[PDB]
Write a structure and sequence with these properties.
By secondary structure, the chain is mostly beta strands. It contains no helices and ten strands. Keywords: Acetylation, Cytokine, Cytoplasm, Glycoprotein, Inflammatory response, Lipoprotein, Mitogen, Myristate, Nucleus, Phosphoprotein, Pyrogen, Secreted.
Length: 151
Amino acid sequence: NVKYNFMRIIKYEFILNDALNQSIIRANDQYLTAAALHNLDEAVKFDMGAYKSSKDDAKITVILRISKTQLYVTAQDEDQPVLLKEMPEIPKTITGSETNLLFFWETHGTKNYFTSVAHPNLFIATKQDYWVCLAGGPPSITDFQILENQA
């Protein structure tokens, strides 16, 4: 089928925080828990790069990775936590399996949402106390924010 091939280099090594403002830190190499920054740079830092096919719908996919290791975000199913799939380097030609790493980036001010471009019913949530889960909407705070560090 048509492959979704890398569009443009977005932002990287930023501190990712939700509307709850919990900078999402990796607690384990498979599970991630969000916690409010005060140094700003305290969470594991992501790097986003958008990738492109004209087979979306009306929404575009970006790549979520932590700058440090190449653990990329897999999209599970609704209220079931986002899984850390280690797929090396941001793909330039994306065919079937890399589809776990699609994110619909809706930016509003500082906060922004990530709807799974494959399935909305997957949505990239941020929790104030619990692990970073998923839902087919939010009642989880699926806000994120690109937060630069204090000094």
